[PDB]
Design an enzyme around this catalytic site. Structure first.
Site: not given
Ligand SMILES: Cc1cc2nc3c(=O)[nH]c(=O)nc-3n(C[C@H](O)[C@H](O)[C@H](O)COP(=O)(O)OP(=O)(O)OC[C@H]3O[C@@H](n4cnc5c(N)ncnc54)[C@H](O)[C@@H]3O)c2cc1C
Ligand SMILES: Cc1cc2nc3c(=O)[nH]c(=O)nc-3n(C[C@H](O)[C@H](O)[C@H](O)COP(=O)(O)OP(=O)(O)OC[C@H]3O[C@@H](n4cnc5c(N)ncnc54)[C@H](O)[C@@H]3O)c2cc1C
Ligand SMILES: CC(C)N1CCN(C(=O)c2cccs2)CC1
Ligand SMILES: CC(C)N1CCN(C(=O)c2cccs2)CC1
Ligand SMILES: [Br-]
Ligand SMILES: [Mg+2]
Ligand SMILES: [Mg+2]
Lengths: 486, 483
Positions: A459
């Protein structure tokens, strides 16, 4: 003058067989071709059709043509420049292509001299007898023998050649051969044919046309790119139309006359007319069997003129084999190469291996391009009781920003719904040819839809669409299309 | 209000889990996030890090950065235009990116409005007890209670957060979060870190920098992109350098002070100095567990601060699960999504499933980009008696004509030479992220090198390199490299 293997045609299949035989089995090999480098008079040369007047220069010229879209599309991402200063210099493109092809011609010359028992002979190969190839000065069987080659084994690898319809004024028309050497980019051009070569060239000419230019592609039937996925055929038609190419379907030139200004007056069978600067005929290619004098040893040809072969590329005449376009099956370089490699691993490696003509990945460098492997659903539906079609079609986000909203990405997986086996994968969009290669490997491994959907996506890519489809869009049941299974 | 499942974090994993539980298993689902749309002050929002300040916007901005190369490369194919008229309008890029991200924010908003049994709550989620999530006004646990949510099952899905070194002047530095909202493109920028985010942003800033601009990337270690194939690490270093990026390896900021004009004066540990307009820290991402008050329920954390999970994403507390970056396994959107789906299938489907964190295809949207799946040779070499490397490295023909002769394509297949099983495929060059996807499917099917070289090439492509390699380039035998 005595050789283990003589090869007529130093092309995609001929060179792979020659080089493998010499370097893998220390065999003694003669390769015959009519020309040492690209272009007029014989166009194909050392390296073959693909190197000289095919895949290689075509892809460079399609890459050139893609800059028309990149320059426009850049504005959506904040790129700014004087759009009024933009010119496409065809002469530069052709000089760069010519230098690239010549370096490959010379790279192959190096290969022959550097390699022991691998000898190149310039001139026209024909069969004198079961075990003698004669090299003459011209395609006339009456011209001077330059050489007489003794052959324990003969490989026919003379490829194909454009078919020119026998209409009045065909002599005012060109093929893909001449298209590679046009001194100037046509303002108006008619590409004749609905296959990949007409489509690819329409895209090239469309990018390089001078101001007030117009590319017209005509096809004698209803829808271009017969043998490709139907959704993709309709979509390419729209996307070519969207980029200013005029698609004339159910139309076919009946004749061409020169106007007094040197331009071409095309009269269609429908009675329509069109004035263009170039008429490029791309209606088919035919095996190059004539000049080989196959009557002299009774090598059997097919109804359509291609050398008849078994699965091992063997003719009816022992010691005489035929690979690539002369066999008039799949006219692709990597198929020719695969056949040559298999033929030599068989005959000289004592390791019999047959080319698989199923599940072959291929591409059309249309803008945007096609990448495909395996069966279209219409074909699957006649062979299998239950066929599922998985489909994801959308304008990728970047093309919403670029302004090319018409660039719909299409990903289709056709399966045997009885066991989930992937029968075909069909892609239209940027990177389709690159996406599809490793799909070829998947299909060789008998991948199921669940092998795709259980793999984790990369992705963000277009490719991850292939790993995101769990639910059929529709089915064929005993040949019948329906949304839902009974 | 009472739920079968409460999801804290409306991100990649959290939304997969919540949508699956609600729509596939007919559960009543609450999801919590701190913002309904992208940007300051909390950056991530409905949609998660990827949507708001990660994969999605960064890919759009690298696509933008790629036109710098396309415009220059066009000339070799005969394209002519007034080079001196060329401007990279960063403001237009950011506005285009913001609309794209806001559109996704809005569509997720509508998904919650239109999906019965799937409710969104705005604010900061934390654990009051093992069956109560409290949503509060702010991250501060003394802030006002907006909701208290009774939960049969609680999923922690709060993702990760940029790591900032406690150095003097850390407050004069930004992370990737702020980089997405710079109003103007920095003339001079230091990206700190050798990971994908530093490298990708160095590419982005390099394309949009105003005239006489300069991008510098610094990395504590000797060679950027640890974890990637070593040939690819060396080539990407060269290719960045060739496009005007200054790579400072064995360097790390000691402190930052403001020059009088308000630019940043960087003191590197080596004593060295650099004046830049922006210092972007990309040195790591840490799980976001601080705000969750996991002490209220005794969910086991690692010293790192990740939530410890078994293979099925189960914490030490029954009915409380964690998926995604918060678990600090593999920080990728599709892994988070896979973990979410696998958890919901296990818990609500009695269809026991665990995410395979091996042979995951990934990309770096460097210029040019990387696509990779499975083991690098150094790793394979410690775990397998005999390792073969098949390698093809060359300037593609089109880059002879383009004038980018530095753009070496690299394709490498790493095998278990005892049986030919592909352990790893590593690609550098145009298309690499697109090529590697179906390679992930190959590795799931225990593809051998013979399955690759017996497949018929698509020509002409970069990908056909994978299907044209018959013979190893070198080996590792009991951990030792033998040409
Ligand atoms: C600059 C950058 C580029 C990236 N590029 C890629 C890429 O090209 N391909 C890829 O596969 N991955 C990429 N990643 C990694 C990817 O973004 C993450 O692995 C993924 O978003 C994590 O998903 P998740 O469900 O663990 O958390 P997240 O998608 O980060 O979701 C966590 C959510 O929880 C919320 N939150 C936090 N604390 C609280 C709280 N206490 N109460 C309520 N809400 C809260 C936040 O606001 C957020 O919306 C990238 C990351 C970054 C930083
Ligand atoms: C415009 C165009 C675009 C194409 N694009 C692609 C593409 O993108 N991908 C793809 O896979 N395929 C493509 N092809 C097809 C590809 O070029 C052929 O499938 C391939 O070249 C066939 O290889 P071969 O070994 O059969 O013969 P060739 O490669 O055609 O080699 C035949 C050689 O034999 C020589 N010869 C002929 N008769 C004699 C004789 N009597 N004595 C001595 N030498 C002789 C010729 O000079 C020629 O060099 C394209 C073809 C064309 C025309
Ligand atoms: C990865 C996979 C889920 N696809 C992402 C890209 N994509 C779209 O652009 C659309 C989103 C919603 C409607 S179309 C189709 C789906
Ligand atoms: C598929 C296989 C035959 N590769 C074709 C492309 N290719 C090159 O273009 C080369 C240029 C410089 C050295 S090799 C590498 C080999
Ligand atoms: Br290192
Ligand atoms: Mg020689
Ligand atoms: Mg709802």
């Amino acid at each position: 003058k005595a050789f283990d293997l003589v090869v007529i045609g130093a092309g995609s299949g001929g060179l792979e067989a020659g080089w493998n035989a010499a370097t893998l089995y220390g065999k003694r090999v003669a390769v015959v071709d009519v020309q040492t480098s690209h272009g007029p008079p014989f166009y194909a040369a050392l390296g073959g059709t693909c190197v000289n007047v095919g895949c290689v220069p075509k892809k460079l010229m399609v890459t050139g043509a893609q800059y028309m879209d990149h320059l426009r599309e850049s504005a959506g991402f904040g790129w700014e420049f004087d759009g009024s200063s933009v010119k496409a210099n065809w002469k530069k493109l052709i000089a760069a292509k010519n230098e690239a092809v010549l370096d490959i011609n010379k790279s192959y010359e190096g290969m022959f001299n550097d390699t022991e028992g691998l000898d190149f002979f310039l001139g026209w190969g024909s069969l004198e007898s079961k075990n003698v190839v004669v090299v003459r000065e011209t395609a006339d069987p009456k011209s001077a023998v330059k050489e007489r080659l003794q052959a324990d084994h003969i490989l026919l690898a003379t490829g194909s050649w454009p078919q020119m319809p026998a209409i009045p004024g065909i002599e005012h028309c060109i093929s893909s051969n001449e298209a590679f050497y046009l001194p100037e980019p046509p303002r108006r051009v008619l590409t004749v044919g609905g296959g990949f070569i007409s489509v690819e060239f329409a895209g090239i000419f469309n990018a390089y046309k001078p101001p007030g230019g117009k590319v017209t592609l005509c096809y004698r039937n209803n829808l271009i790119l017969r043998g490709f996925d139907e959704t993709i055929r309709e979509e390419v038609t729209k996307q070519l139309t969207a980029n200013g190419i005029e698609i004339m379907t159910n139309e076919n030139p009946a004749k061409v006359s020169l106007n007094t200004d040197g331009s071409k007056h095309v009269t269609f069978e429908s009675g329509k007319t069109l004035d263009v600067d170039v008429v490029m005929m791309a209606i088919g290619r035919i095996p190059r069997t004539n000049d080989l004098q196959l009557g002299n040893v009774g090598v059997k040809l097919t109804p359509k003129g291609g050398v008849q072969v078994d699965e091992f590329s063997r003719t009816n005449v022992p010691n005489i084999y035929a690979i690539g376009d002369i066999t008039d099956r799949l006219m692709l370089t990597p198929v020719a190469i695969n056949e040559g490699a298999a033929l030599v691993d068989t005959v000289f490696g004592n390791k019999p291996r047959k080319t698989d003509h199923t599940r072959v990945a291929s591409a059309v460098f249309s803008i945007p391009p096609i990448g495909t492997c395996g069966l279209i659903e219409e074909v699957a539906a006649k062979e299998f009781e239950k066929v599922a079609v998985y489909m994801s079609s959308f304008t990728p986000l970047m093309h919403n920003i670029s302004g090319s909203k018409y660039k719909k990405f299409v990903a289709k997986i056709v399966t045997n719904h009885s066991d989930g086996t992937v029968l075909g994968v069909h892609l239209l969009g940027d990177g389709a040819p690159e996406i599809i290669q490793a799909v070829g490997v998947c299909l060789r491994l008998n991948a199921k839809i669940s092998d795709f959907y259980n793999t984790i996506g990369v992705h963000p890519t277009s490719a991850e669409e292939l790993c995101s489809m769990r639910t059929p869009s529709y089915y064929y049941v005993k040949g019948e299309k329906m949304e839902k299974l009974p």
